[PDB]
Ligand binder design. Structure first.
Ligand SMILES: Nc1ncnc2c1ncn2[C@@H]1O[C@H](COP(=O)(O)OP(=O)(O)OP(O)(O)=S)[C@@H](O)[C@H]1O
Ligand SMILES: [Mg+2]
Length: 320
């Protein structure tokens, strides 16, 4: 009477219908569910998410040490969203955002809504009011940790002191999620690891995607300062097989390196052969060293476009 796979599929189907698609899935699976996404500005990361970017209408948590590249990504995500004609909001509670650099990542600052809350309550509340106006494509919150409760902001008392910030973050997400789904706005919470910074206790559970951003390199070329290589681990993904990983370069002053990406993905996917210490494409000399090659590609814009083309086809081409 027993046939495992037939009895497993039936189980899984039931699992998914009781708790929503993505509740459980084979790791080696491949999802042709396109959803809707905001390209992360990182091709590797985009592929890593399995859907080409951050799904829309969901809670995304981007946690990681300072300087690791979290807000850069978040900023790119905002820029992409805006070019698709979407409206963006930035609930700033850190007062660290540098609009100039943001413009450089392609963000249209002037049309970017910014709000600098007085309390954690107000901040989440402002975000919630915006998000249920349905006019927003993406809303990023700086600093999960800067969401400190009012009672705490206003010299409270060492008594009746509580785990108040986490609860604040839970009640807030409880109602902001539904709204987020109806509206379709993607909400990116930036969580600096310095619970997951107190409020990330719930974030962990409410997020459909959670990125673990980490700094792994110092982008040196050969011997001087240009930027840093980042590594993102998709620790949680309710819309595609999780645990994938992506790497990419962020230069000082310049957002995620396109050419850099192309060179990397290009190589691992064959299209660009890498005789040790010399990069070459379709018989053309690219240069010695990731930078010379990066340069080559940035300059000969024609090449690196047929590459971007070739890599794009082999992975995620237009669907359904
Ligand atoms: N204002 C800026 N001007 C020029 N480059 C910047 C600026 N801010 C960040 N960068 C670049 O972005 C890289 C790191 O990205 P971040 O914005 O720090 O992402 P991240 O670490 O989540 O952000 P933090 O530190 O939480 S704010 C830095 O190493 C620089 O290369
Ligand atoms: Mg004030």
């Amino acid at each position: 009477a027993p046939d495992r796979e037939k009895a497993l599929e039936l189980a899984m189907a039931q699992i998914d219908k009781n708790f929503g698609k993505g509740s459980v899935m084979r790791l080696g699976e491949e999802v042709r569910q396109p959803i809707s996404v905001i390209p992360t500005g990182s091709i590797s990361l985009d592929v890593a998410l399995g859907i080409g970017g951050l799904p829309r209408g969901r809670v995304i948590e981007i946690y990681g040490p300072e300087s690791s590249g979290k807000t850069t990504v978040a900023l790119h995500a905002v820029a992409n969203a805006q070019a698709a004609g979407g409206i963006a909001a930035f609930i700033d509670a850190e007062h660290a955002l540098d609009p100039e650099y943001a413009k450089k990542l392609g963000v249209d600052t002037d049309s970017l809504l910014v709000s600098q809350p007085d309390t954690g309550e107000q901040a989440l509340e402002i975000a919630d009011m915006l998000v249920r106006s349905g006019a927003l494509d993406i809303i990023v919150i700086d600093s999960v940790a800067a969401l400190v409760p009012r009672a705490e902001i206003e010299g409270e008392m060492g008594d009746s002191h509580v785990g108040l910030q986490a609860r604040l973050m839970s009640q807030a997400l409880r109602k902001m999620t539904g709204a987020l789904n109806n509206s379709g706005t993607t909400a990116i919470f930036i969580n600096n690891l310095r619970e997951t910074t107190t409020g990330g206790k719930a974030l962990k559970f409410y997020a459909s995607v959670r990125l673990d951003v980490r700094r792994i390199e110092t982008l040196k070329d050969g011997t001087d300062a240009v930027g840093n290589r980042t590594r993102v681990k998709v620790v949680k993904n309710k819309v595609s097989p999780p645990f994938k990983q992506a790497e990419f370069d962020i230069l000082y002053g310049q957002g995620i390196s396109r050419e850099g990406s192309l060179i990397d993905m290009g190589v691992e996917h064959g299209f660009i052969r890498k005789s040790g210490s010399w990069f070459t494409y379709e018989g053309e000399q690219l240069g010695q060293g990731k930078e010379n090659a990066r340069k080559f590609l940035l300059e000969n814009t024609d090449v690196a476009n047929e590459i971007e083309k070739k890599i794009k086809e082999k992975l995620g081409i237009g669907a359904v």
